[PDB]
């Protein structure tokens, strides 16, 4: 068995084809087992509609999830990603790194 805690990165990207669009991305990388729960949060509340959840694996024991959706961030809200995984004794909430 192997278990590896996800790395979690929360960042925004504008698709170049539509710079008015902005995606909130939670990139959950390098984890095993694959079992995982990942939410984007706005002011602590899970964003229910997350348009994209792209899961891949490299080695059989390393999974990668890009969980992302369009958003329109303002300064008045806090955006984050919450991940639960067996490696994490508590849900990990990672705030949007507005510089990343
Ligand atoms: Na957890």
């Amino acid at each position: 068995m192997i278990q590896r805690t996800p790395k979690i990165q929360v960042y925004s990207r504008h698709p170049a084809e539509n710079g008015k669009s902005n995606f909130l991305n939670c990139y959950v990388s390098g984890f095993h087992p694959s079992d995982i729960e990942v939410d984007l949060l706005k002011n602590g509340e899970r964003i229910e509609k997350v348009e994209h959840s792209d899961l891949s694996f490299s080695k059989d024991w390393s999974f990668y999830l890009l969980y992302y959706t369009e958003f329109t961030p303002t300064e008045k809200n806090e955006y984050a990603c919450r991940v639960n995984h067996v490696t994490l004794s508590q849900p990990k909430i990672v705030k949007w790194d507005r510089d990343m």
Side-chain angles (χ1 to χ4, degrees):
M1 60 86 74
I2 189 161
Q3 60 190 29
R4 297 171 76 210
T5 198
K7 175 183 183 193
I8 302 159
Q9 291 172 108
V10 187
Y11 57 93
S12 63
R13 296 287 175 262
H14 301 279
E17 292 194 349
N18 181 192
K20 297 88 174 158
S21 176
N22 204 356
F23 285 90
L24 181 61
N25 293 270
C26 182
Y27 181 47
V28 183
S29 63
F31 62 94
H32 200 258
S34 63
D35 301 62
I36 204 160
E37 180 173 27
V38 176
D39 282 293
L40 295 178
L41 311 174
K42 177 182 175 191
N43 299 323
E45 302 298 326
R46 81 184 275 284
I47 304 176
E48 279 169 353
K49 173 206 146 113
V50 171
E51 305 149 328
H52 300 276
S53 187
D54 292 341
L55 182 74
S56 60
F57 63 89
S58 64
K59 305 301 184 180
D60 286 351
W61 52 88
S62 190
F63 280 77
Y64 299 88
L65 178 70
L66 185 62
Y67 183 72
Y68 68 105
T69 202
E70 291 167 341
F71 83 141
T72 297
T74 74
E75 301 284 353
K76 291 187 169 59
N77 300 302
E78 76 176 323
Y79 301 89
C81 187
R82 182 176 64 205
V83 175
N84 280 304
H85 188 260
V86 282
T87 58
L88 294 168
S89 53
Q90 301 303 316
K92 200 168 264 192
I93 296 172
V94 177
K95 300 184 183 189
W96 175 28
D97 182 349
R98 300 193 182 218
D99 300 318
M100 181 185 281

